[PDB]
DNA sequence: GGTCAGAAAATCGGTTGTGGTCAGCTGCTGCCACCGGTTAACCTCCAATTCTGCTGCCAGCCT
């Protein structure tokens with residue numbers, strides 16, 4: 001079916017929870033071409049997923065952050 | 077025009093705090109399900125054929 005075209009499970013699944021701001025960036029933008037962004041993002045927002053890339057967007061424990069804040073002192 | 081204390085990020089983890097929450101009985105209380113005993117005019121005996129082997133039976137020579 002359309003399973004190998006689905007960009008979620010094409011490669012290694014441990015990529016999409018890597019705890020670097022730059023590592024998961026290609027994981028987030030790899031769901032640009034995903035055919036099911038609407039329903040996946042809708043399910044992720046309704047069930048309140050606390051981790052990882054969902055619907056081509058990252059998640060905190062309840063909501064969506066724009067980009068994950070890096071380790072260290074943030075920029076003034 | 078470079079080194080050292082403080083501030084500010086998640087991050088892994090302990091506290092903690094209470095706010096319900098669900099169950100675990102626990103009486104307990106009513107009830108309900110189930111088992112056992114009892115009834116004192118009289119009237120006291122049932123509703124097909126084919127083949128093989130076994131046993132019961134009667135005349136009848138033999139002693």
Ligand code: SF4
Nearest residue numbers: 008031034040055056
């Ligand atoms: S997170 Fe995005 S890319 Fe991954 S399966 Fe869901 S919609 Fe597709």
